[PDB]
Short mmCIF file of C-alpha atoms and ligand atoms in Angstrom, two decimals:
data_model
loop_
_atom_site.label_atom_id
_atom_site.label_comp_id
_atom_site.label_asym_id
_atom_site.label_seq_id
_atom_site.Cartn_x
_atom_site.Cartn_y
_atom_site.Cartn_z
CA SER C 1 76.69 119.34 169.26
CA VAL C 2 74.26 118.37 166.49
CA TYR C 3 77.06 118.99 163.91
CA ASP C 4 79.48 116.58 165.57
CA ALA C 5 76.66 114.00 165.95
CA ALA C 6 75.84 114.44 162.26
CA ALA C 7 79.53 113.75 161.45
CA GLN C 8 79.24 110.27 162.96
CA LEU C 9 77.03 109.22 160.05
CA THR C 10 79.80 107.57 158.10
CA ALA C 11 79.52 105.82 154.74
CA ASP C 12 78.77 102.46 156.30
CA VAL C 13 76.18 103.85 158.76
CA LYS C 14 74.49 105.73 155.89
CA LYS C 15 74.39 102.50 153.86
CA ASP C 16 72.82 100.45 156.66
CA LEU C 17 70.22 103.18 157.28
CA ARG C 18 69.23 103.20 153.59
CA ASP C 19 69.18 99.41 153.14
CA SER C 20 66.99 98.90 156.23
CA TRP C 21 64.71 101.87 155.44
CA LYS C 22 63.87 100.24 152.06
CA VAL C 23 62.11 97.54 154.07
CA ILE C 24 60.75 99.43 157.10
CA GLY C 25 59.69 102.51 155.14
CA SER C 26 57.69 100.45 152.71
CA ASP C 27 54.80 100.00 155.21
CA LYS C 28 54.58 103.29 156.99
CA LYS C 29 51.16 102.66 158.54
CA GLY C 30 51.88 99.16 159.83
CA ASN C 31 55.47 99.88 160.94
CA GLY C 32 54.72 103.34 162.39
CA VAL C 33 51.84 101.86 164.49
CA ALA C 34 54.11 98.99 165.65
CA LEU C 35 56.80 101.42 166.71
CA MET C 36 54.38 103.56 168.80
CA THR C 37 52.60 100.57 170.44
CA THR C 38 55.94 99.00 171.33
CA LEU C 39 56.99 102.33 172.89
CA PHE C 40 53.77 102.42 174.98
CA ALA C 41 54.00 98.76 176.03
CA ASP C 42 57.69 98.80 177.04
CA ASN C 43 57.74 102.37 178.40
CA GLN C 44 54.40 102.84 180.09
CA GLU C 45 55.58 106.05 181.71
CA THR C 46 55.60 107.91 178.39
CA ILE C 47 51.90 107.48 177.59
CA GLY C 48 50.95 110.63 179.50
CA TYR C 49 52.88 112.78 176.95
CA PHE C 50 50.40 111.59 174.30
CA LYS C 51 47.12 112.66 175.96
CA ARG C 52 46.01 114.35 172.72
CA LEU C 53 45.80 110.94 170.92
CA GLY C 54 43.18 109.54 173.37
CA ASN C 55 43.20 105.79 174.05
CA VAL C 56 46.53 104.62 172.67
CA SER C 57 45.81 101.01 173.67
CA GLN C 58 43.39 100.92 170.76
CA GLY C 59 46.40 100.77 168.41
CA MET C 60 45.51 100.80 164.67
CA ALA C 61 41.81 101.41 165.47
CA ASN C 62 42.62 104.84 166.96
CA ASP C 63 42.48 107.40 164.12
CA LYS C 64 44.65 109.95 165.89
CA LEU C 65 47.32 107.38 166.72
CA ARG C 66 47.24 106.16 163.07
CA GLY C 67 47.58 109.78 161.87
CA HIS C 68 50.44 110.38 164.28
CA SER C 69 52.22 107.15 163.36
CA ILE C 70 52.13 107.62 159.58
CA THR C 71 53.41 111.18 160.05
CA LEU C 72 56.34 110.06 162.26
CA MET C 73 57.34 107.63 159.44
CA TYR C 74 57.58 110.66 157.07
CA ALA C 75 59.88 112.43 159.54
CA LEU C 76 62.17 109.35 159.21
CA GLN C 77 61.76 109.49 155.38
CA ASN C 78 62.88 113.13 155.62
CA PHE C 79 66.06 112.34 157.60
CA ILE C 80 66.96 109.47 155.25
CA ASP C 81 66.57 111.85 152.21
CA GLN C 82 68.87 114.43 153.86
CA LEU C 83 71.81 112.09 154.56
CA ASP C 84 73.74 113.40 151.49
CA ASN C 85 73.79 116.91 152.95
CA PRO C 86 74.70 117.64 156.56
CA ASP C 87 73.49 121.24 156.68
CA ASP C 88 70.09 120.07 155.43
CA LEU C 89 69.84 117.11 157.79
CA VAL C 90 70.73 119.46 160.67
CA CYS C 91 68.03 121.99 159.81
CA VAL C 92 65.28 119.31 159.60
CA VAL C 93 66.58 117.70 162.84
CA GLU C 94 66.33 121.11 164.57
CA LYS C 95 62.76 121.63 163.31
CA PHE C 96 61.56 118.28 164.78
CA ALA C 97 63.64 118.93 167.97
CA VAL C 98 61.55 122.04 168.51
CA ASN C 99 58.33 119.90 168.34
CA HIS C 100 59.65 117.75 171.23
CA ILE C 101 61.27 120.53 173.23
CA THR C 102 57.86 122.24 173.50
CA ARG C 103 56.35 118.96 174.76
CA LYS C 104 59.10 118.79 177.42
CA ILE C 105 60.82 115.70 175.97
CA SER C 106 64.46 115.33 177.09
CA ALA C 107 67.32 113.62 175.20
CA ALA C 108 67.04 110.76 177.60
CA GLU C 109 63.32 110.29 177.07
CA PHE C 110 63.69 110.66 173.30
CA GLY C 111 66.25 107.77 173.37
CA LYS C 112 63.50 105.42 174.67
CA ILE C 113 62.57 104.97 170.99
CA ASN C 114 65.77 102.87 170.51
CA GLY C 115 64.08 99.84 172.10
CA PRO C 116 61.07 99.89 169.78
CA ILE C 117 63.33 100.48 166.69
CA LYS C 118 65.55 97.49 167.49
CA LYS C 119 62.40 95.38 167.98
CA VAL C 120 60.70 96.47 164.75
CA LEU C 121 63.98 95.89 162.83
CA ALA C 122 64.40 92.46 164.47
CA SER C 123 60.91 91.48 163.42
CA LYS C 124 62.05 92.10 159.80
CA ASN C 125 65.35 90.16 160.24
CA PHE C 126 67.52 93.28 160.71
CA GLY C 127 69.95 92.69 163.61
CA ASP C 128 72.03 94.67 166.05
CA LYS C 129 74.21 96.15 163.28
CA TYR C 130 71.09 97.92 161.95
CA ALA C 131 69.71 98.80 165.40
CA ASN C 132 73.09 100.42 166.07
CA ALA C 133 73.00 102.45 162.80
CA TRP C 134 69.58 103.74 163.81
CA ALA C 135 70.83 104.74 167.29
CA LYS C 136 73.41 106.99 165.59
CA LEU C 137 70.62 108.75 163.69
CA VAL C 138 68.42 109.10 166.82
CA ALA C 139 71.58 110.54 168.52
CA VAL C 140 71.60 113.48 166.10
CA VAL C 141 68.10 114.42 167.32
CA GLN C 142 69.25 113.81 170.90
CA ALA C 143 72.07 116.36 170.47
CA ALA C 144 69.36 118.91 169.55
CA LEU C 145 67.17 118.42 172.69
CA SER P 1 32.85 116.01 156.14
CA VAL P 2 36.57 115.71 155.39
CA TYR P 3 35.76 112.17 154.38
CA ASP P 4 33.23 113.54 151.90
CA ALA P 5 35.75 115.99 150.45
CA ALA P 6 38.44 113.23 150.38
CA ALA P 7 36.04 110.67 148.94
CA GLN P 8 35.18 113.09 146.14
CA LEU P 9 38.72 113.23 144.52
CA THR P 10 38.33 111.27 141.25
CA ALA P 11 40.68 109.06 139.29
CA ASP P 12 41.41 111.99 136.92
CA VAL P 13 42.16 114.43 139.74
CA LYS P 14 44.35 111.79 141.41
CA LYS P 15 46.28 111.21 138.16
CA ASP P 16 46.90 114.99 137.74
CA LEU P 17 48.14 115.25 141.35
CA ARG P 18 50.49 112.29 141.04
CA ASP P 19 51.84 113.43 137.67
CA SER P 20 52.58 116.97 138.81
CA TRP P 21 54.02 115.78 142.19
CA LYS P 22 56.42 113.48 140.29
CA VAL P 23 58.06 116.78 139.20
CA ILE P 24 57.29 119.27 141.98
CA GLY P 25 58.13 116.79 144.75
CA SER P 26 61.49 115.84 143.23
CA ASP P 27 63.21 119.01 144.52
CA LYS P 28 61.70 119.47 147.97
CA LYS P 29 64.22 122.03 149.16
CA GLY P 30 64.06 124.22 146.04
CA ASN P 31 60.32 123.87 145.51
CA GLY P 32 59.31 124.11 149.20
CA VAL P 33 61.40 127.30 149.66
CA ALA P 34 59.93 128.67 146.46
CA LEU P 35 56.38 128.03 147.80
CA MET P 36 57.10 129.78 151.09
CA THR P 37 58.86 132.81 149.59
CA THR P 38 55.99 133.25 147.06
CA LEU P 39 53.48 133.14 149.91
CA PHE P 40 55.49 135.86 151.72
CA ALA P 41 55.80 138.01 148.58
CA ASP P 42 52.17 137.84 147.60
CA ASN P 43 50.56 137.69 151.08
CA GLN P 44 52.76 139.93 153.23
CA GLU P 45 50.09 139.83 155.95
CA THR P 46 51.04 136.18 156.71
CA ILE P 47 54.68 137.00 157.59
CA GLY P 48 53.76 137.65 161.21
CA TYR P 49 52.51 134.07 161.72
CA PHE P 50 56.02 132.76 161.02
CA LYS P 51 57.95 134.69 163.67
CA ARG P 52 59.58 131.49 164.92
CA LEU P 53 61.40 131.24 161.55
CA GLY P 54 63.16 134.60 162.09
CA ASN P 55 63.95 136.77 159.01
CA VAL P 56 62.11 135.00 156.23
CA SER P 57 63.60 137.49 153.77
CA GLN P 58 66.90 135.49 153.98
CA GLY P 59 65.38 132.79 151.74
CA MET P 60 67.36 129.55 151.46
CA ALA P 61 70.06 130.97 153.72
CA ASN P 62 67.70 130.88 156.78
CA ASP P 63 68.15 127.42 158.24
CA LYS P 64 64.80 127.51 160.14
CA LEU P 65 63.01 128.52 156.95
CA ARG P 66 64.74 125.81 154.98
CA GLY P 67 63.83 123.16 157.61
CA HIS P 68 60.17 124.25 157.71
CA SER P 69 59.98 124.29 153.87
CA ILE P 70 61.45 120.80 153.33
CA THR P 71 59.12 119.50 156.07
CA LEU P 72 56.10 121.10 154.38
CA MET P 73 56.96 119.12 151.20
CA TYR P 74 56.83 115.87 153.19
CA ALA P 75 53.32 116.72 154.42
CA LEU P 76 52.37 116.94 150.74
CA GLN P 77 54.29 113.72 150.10
CA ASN P 78 52.15 112.13 152.81
CA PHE P 79 48.89 113.37 151.30
CA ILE P 80 49.84 112.14 147.86
CA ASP P 81 50.81 108.64 149.09
CA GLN P 82 47.40 108.35 150.91
CA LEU P 83 45.16 109.26 147.89
CA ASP P 84 43.92 105.71 147.31
CA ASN P 85 42.72 105.20 150.93
CA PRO P 86 40.32 107.95 152.02
CA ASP P 87 40.41 106.63 155.61
CA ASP P 88 44.19 107.15 155.82
CA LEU P 89 44.10 110.51 154.00
CA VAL P 90 41.43 111.71 156.44
CA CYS P 91 43.49 110.82 159.53
CA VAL P 92 46.67 112.54 158.17
CA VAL P 93 44.70 115.63 157.06
CA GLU P 94 43.14 115.94 160.54
CA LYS P 95 46.60 115.69 162.11
CA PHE P 96 47.94 118.57 159.98
CA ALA P 97 44.72 120.58 160.50
CA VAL P 98 45.36 120.49 164.28
CA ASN P 99 48.82 122.04 163.71
CA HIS P 100 47.07 124.98 162.00
CA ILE P 101 43.99 125.33 164.17
CA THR P 102 46.32 125.79 167.12
CA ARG P 103 47.97 128.74 165.27
CA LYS P 104 44.53 130.18 164.58
CA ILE P 105 44.72 129.62 160.77
CA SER P 106 41.24 129.72 159.25
CA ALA P 107 40.04 127.69 156.22
CA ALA P 108 40.13 130.90 154.15
CA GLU P 109 43.69 131.80 155.25
CA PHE P 110 44.82 128.20 154.56
CA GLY P 111 43.41 128.65 151.02
CA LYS P 112 45.98 131.47 150.53
CA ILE P 113 48.46 128.70 149.53
CA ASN P 114 46.59 128.09 146.19
CA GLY P 115 48.31 131.17 144.62
CA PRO P 116 51.87 130.08 145.42
CA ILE P 117 51.02 126.54 144.31
CA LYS P 118 49.63 127.73 140.97
CA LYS P 119 52.88 129.76 140.40
CA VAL P 120 55.20 126.94 141.32
CA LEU P 121 53.27 124.53 139.07
CA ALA P 122 53.35 127.08 136.25
CA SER P 123 57.13 127.33 136.63
CA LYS P 124 57.28 123.66 135.53
CA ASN P 125 54.64 124.23 132.78
CA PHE P 126 51.76 122.59 134.66
CA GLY P 127 48.78 124.80 133.75
CA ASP P 128 45.31 125.48 135.03
CA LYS P 129 44.02 121.87 135.00
CA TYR P 130 46.86 121.03 137.48
CA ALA P 131 46.25 124.11 139.70
CA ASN P 132 42.51 123.14 139.91
CA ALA P 133 43.49 119.61 140.92
CA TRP P 134 45.75 120.98 143.74
CA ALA P 135 42.95 123.38 144.89
CA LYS P 136 40.78 120.26 145.33
CA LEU P 137 43.41 118.63 147.60
CA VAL P 138 43.82 121.88 149.59
CA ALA P 139 39.98 121.82 149.90
CA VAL P 140 40.27 118.54 151.84
CA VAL P 141 42.36 120.34 154.49
CA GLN P 142 39.96 123.31 154.42
CA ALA P 143 37.12 120.81 155.25
CA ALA P 144 38.99 120.20 158.54
CA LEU P 145 39.51 123.90 159.46
C1 HEM S 1 62.19 108.22 165.96
C2 HEM S 1 61.86 109.08 166.89
C3 HEM S 1 60.71 110.08 166.76
C4 HEM S 1 60.23 110.74 165.71
C5 HEM S 1 60.79 110.78 164.25
C6 HEM S 1 59.17 111.61 166.17
C7 HEM S 1 58.41 112.40 165.34
C8 HEM S 1 57.35 113.18 165.71
C9 HEM S 1 56.58 114.06 164.86
C10 HEM S 1 56.77 114.21 163.33
C11 HEM S 1 55.64 114.63 165.63
C12 HEM S 1 54.54 115.67 165.24
C13 HEM S 1 54.99 117.07 165.68
C14 HEM S 1 53.81 118.03 165.82
O1 HEM S 1 52.86 117.86 165.01
O2 HEM S 1 53.94 118.86 166.74
C15 HEM S 1 55.87 114.19 167.00
C16 HEM S 1 55.12 114.55 168.10
C17 HEM S 1 55.26 114.11 169.38
N1 HEM S 1 56.30 113.30 169.82
FE1 HEM S 1 57.65 112.38 168.66
N2 HEM S 1 58.94 111.33 167.52
C18 HEM S 1 59.86 110.42 167.90
C19 HEM S 1 60.01 109.92 169.19
C20 HEM S 1 59.32 110.39 170.26
C21 HEM S 1 59.45 109.88 171.63
C22 HEM S 1 60.46 108.79 172.06
C23 HEM S 1 58.63 110.63 172.42
C24 HEM S 1 58.31 110.47 173.94
C25 HEM S 1 59.32 110.02 174.73
C26 HEM S 1 57.89 111.53 171.56
C27 HEM S 1 56.93 112.40 172.01
C28 HEM S 1 56.11 113.15 171.19
C29 HEM S 1 54.88 113.83 171.59
C30 HEM S 1 54.33 113.83 173.02
C31 HEM S 1 54.41 114.46 170.51
C32 HEM S 1 53.12 115.28 170.31
C33 HEM S 1 51.90 114.34 170.05
C34 HEM S 1 50.61 115.16 169.89
O3 HEM S 1 50.11 115.64 170.93
O4 HEM S 1 50.26 115.27 168.70
N3 HEM S 1 58.36 111.39 170.27
N4 HEM S 1 56.88 113.27 167.01
C1 HEM S 2 49.91 123.16 151.37
C2 HEM S 2 49.68 123.96 152.39
C3 HEM S 2 50.35 123.74 153.76
C4 HEM S 2 50.99 122.67 154.28
C5 HEM S 2 51.15 121.24 153.71
C6 HEM S 2 51.52 123.07 155.58
C7 HEM S 2 52.24 122.29 156.44
C8 HEM S 2 52.80 122.62 157.66
C9 HEM S 2 53.62 121.80 158.51
C10 HEM S 2 54.04 120.35 158.15
C11 HEM S 2 53.95 122.53 159.57
C12 HEM S 2 54.80 122.14 160.82
C13 HEM S 2 53.79 121.93 162.04
C14 HEM S 2 54.48 121.87 163.39
O1 HEM S 2 55.53 121.13 163.37
O2 HEM S 2 53.99 122.51 164.37
C15 HEM S 2 53.32 123.82 159.44
C16 HEM S 2 53.38 124.88 160.29
C17 HEM S 2 52.82 126.13 160.19
N1 HEM S 2 51.97 126.51 159.19
FE1 HEM S 2 51.58 125.45 157.51
N2 HEM S 2 51.17 124.37 155.84
C18 HEM S 2 50.46 124.82 154.75
C19 HEM S 2 49.97 126.07 154.63
C20 HEM S 2 50.00 127.11 155.51
C21 HEM S 2 49.45 128.44 155.31
C22 HEM S 2 48.74 128.80 153.97
C23 HEM S 2 49.64 129.14 156.42
C24 HEM S 2 49.29 130.58 156.80
C25 HEM S 2 48.31 131.25 156.20
C26 HEM S 2 50.33 128.25 157.36
C27 HEM S 2 50.75 128.55 158.64
C28 HEM S 2 51.57 127.77 159.46
C29 HEM S 2 52.22 128.24 160.68
C30 HEM S 2 52.07 129.64 161.25
C31 HEM S 2 52.97 127.21 161.11
C32 HEM S 2 53.90 127.21 162.35
C33 HEM S 2 55.32 127.69 161.97
C34 HEM S 2 56.30 127.58 163.15
O3 HEM S 2 56.24 128.52 163.97
O4 HEM S 2 57.04 126.57 163.18
N3 HEM S 2 50.52 127.02 156.78
N4 HEM S 2 52.65 123.87 158.22
#
């Protein structure tokens, strides 16, 4: 249930999301590209979903991947801005869920982003506490898939 | 080229965009929904394209409509944040263009948003100079369609 998952975003979780986002969200291009390339490198079996982007091993040099990456960072921006209001967060979550459901992405496959998030956070000196906050957010999308 | 169109936006046009977005982009739910419902009122022929959103006449009450509208505002957020780097603006524009090409939305039909934008701007007392600036940004997307 997306509503019950949404309810798990307590005060403290909300705080850690915001605090960490101030750092990560400040370089959407660099951080968005790092997230995607870490996904591809650690979870080789997902690359086939992204045929439209072309040669993903090109990283920042691939225009489509750069376009994709920036845009994904605005989806995260979106979620962060909706934390005050659960009915609003849920509706945006459901919109992006649709984008993945049509590409045949399951909850389980969607959760493969947790690895890359924890890594990108760690590279910025945000630890397990923060990785765990982010898993709770990703879980809300999971509940929609 | 899109690059050409992007590259042409001047310091004055950029200033007008940023200034008006400071206001319009501060209420993404209210302003995005306003944009969409004005499109529907003025261009009833477009309603059919949005069948996934269900009964668009329900306004803010329609959760799918609200999610699409807030998300639309973040596409604009993205555009605005990329104005100083034509290379980055081009790659996000091309990403959004693909979303519309796939729904068979022509450059001319995309341009139907100018009306709703002019009205929303007007609502906050941004006049003709501001609507012309926004038509120039829209023209970047039309360059890709
Ligand atoms: C933090 C988690 C994620 C976010 C916020 C997110 C966000 C997005 C957004 C905004 C789009 C563009 C939607 C569209 O234009 O149709 C998208 C597309 C896509 N996503 Fe995700 N994504 C995430 C994780 C994942 C993961 C883990 C997978 C694969 C396991 C995945 C697979 C895809 C694919 C295949 C597409 C379409 C790419 C294309 O052909 O343009 N996403 N994602
Ligand atoms: C400022 C102008 C516009 C912006 C920034 C914008 C942005 C977006 C975004 C971000 C999406 C979601 C893409 C996806 O997830 O698949 C979308 C979808 C869509 N757009 Fe636009 N759009 C604009 C104008 C228009 C206009 C003028 C039309 C029609 C004449 C249109 C038709 C569509 C349709 C049919 C969809 C798919 C809706 C659905 O079934 O989910 N768009 N747009």
